[PDB]
């Protein structure tokens, strides 16, 4: 009889399974951003949709009306923080025009790739999974982390691991050992 825990399904499947063009688009997207699943894409889409729902609702209310002024503004701020909206477009009307690419071009994946540190997206992903790459001296394991624009300045290798300068570890170490008494 303890208080229930809240779950939420964070993605939504397409309403039509084998829409070929759509499928191809999805594939292309995956290729672009080193996505393990269509599931990731779906998640992103769902997120976008949620935002859109909010925005539309806000629009439906009169402009300069309190609720719109507040909630909508907050949403806009959030978007700007995340780095999906640009400073030109703090508008709420522009929130509807966002599209899936802007969210994917903001993952700790893509960001990692686009700052050096990588050589292709797959490599970056591997690095992320492998516990290389820290943000604010905090090692991030998550490929789809959503880099918060002000933290984007701080993406670097960890103080642990090689690459960012510590003990080589595992394979290199083994090699060294082998070299040692020979």
Partner RNA sequence: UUCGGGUCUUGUAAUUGGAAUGAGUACAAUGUAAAUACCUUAACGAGGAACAACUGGAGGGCAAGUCUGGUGCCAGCAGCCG
Partner RNA sequence: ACCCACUCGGCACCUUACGAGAAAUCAAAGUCUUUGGGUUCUGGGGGGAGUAUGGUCGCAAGGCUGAAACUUAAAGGAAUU
**∠ Cα 125 123 120 (to 5°):** 110
For residue 92, give the nearest of 78, 112, 106 by alpha carbon.
78
Q: Which of 1, 7, 18, 116 touches RNA (CB under 7 A)? A: 18
Q: Which of 10, 12, 13, 23 touches RNA (CB under 7 A)? A: 23
Task: For CA atoms 20, 21, 24, 25, give the dihedral sign.
Answer: negative
What spatial distance separates the first Cα and last Cα of the chain, rounded to whole Å? 67
**Least distance from C-beta 45 to Mg ion, angstroms?**
25
Is 132 one of the binding residues for RNA (CB under 7 A)? yes
Residue 69 binding partner per list other proteins, Mg ion, RNA, none, with a CB distance cut-off of 5 to 8 Å that depends on partner kind:
none
**Least distance from C-beta 25 to other proteins, angstroms?**
10
Q: Which of 64, 171, 180, 181 touches RNA (CB under 7 A)? A: 171
Nearest-angstrom CA–CA distance, 137 and 155: 9
Nearest-angstrom CA–CA distance, 89 and 95: 8
Q: Which is nearer to other proteins, 88 or 150 (CB)?
A: 88
Residue 30 binding partner per list RNA, other proteins, Mg ion, none, with a CB distance cut-off of 5 to 8 Å that depends on partner kind:
other proteins
For residue 153, give the nearest of 165, 135, 141 by alpha carbon.
135
Asked if residues 143 and 130 have their Cβ atoms less than 8 Å apart, the reply is: no
Q: Which is nearer to RNA, 81 or 160 (CB)?
A: 160
Is 144 one of the binding residues for RNA (CB under 7 A)? no
Residue 149 binding partner per list Mg ion, other proteins, RNA, none, with a CB distance cut-off of 5 to 8 Å that depends on partner kind:
none
Q: Which is nearer to other proteins, 59 or 115 (CB)?
A: 59
Is 8 one of the binding residues for RNA (CB under 7 A)? no
Task: For CA atoms 25, 119, 163, 105, give the dihedral sign.
Answer: negative
Is 43 one of the binding residues for RNA (CB under 7 A)? no
């Amino acid at each position: 009889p303890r208080a229930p825990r809240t779950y939420s399904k964070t993605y939504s499947t397409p309403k039509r399974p084998y829409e070929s063009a759509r499928l191809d688009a999805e594939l292309k997207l995956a290729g672009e951003y080193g996505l393990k699943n269509k599931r990731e894409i779906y998640r992103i889409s769902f997120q976008l949709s949620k935002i859109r729902r909010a925005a539309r609702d806000l629009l439906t209310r009169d402009e300069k009306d309190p609720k719109r002024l507040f909630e909508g503004n907050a949403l806009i701020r959030r978007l700007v923080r995340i780095g999906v909206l640009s400073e030109d477009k703090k508008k709420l009307d522009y929130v509807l025009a966002l599209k899936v690419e802007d969210f994917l071009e903001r993952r700790l994946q893509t960001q990692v790739y686009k700052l050096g540190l990588a050589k292709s997206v797959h490599h970056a992903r591997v690095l992320i999974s492998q516990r290389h790459i820290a943000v604010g001296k905090q090692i991030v394991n998550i490929p789809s982390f959503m880099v918060r624009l002000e933290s984007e300045k701080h993406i670097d290798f960890a103080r642990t691991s090689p690459f960012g300068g510590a003990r080589p570890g595992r394979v290199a170490r083994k090699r060294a050992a082998a070299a040692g008494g020979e």
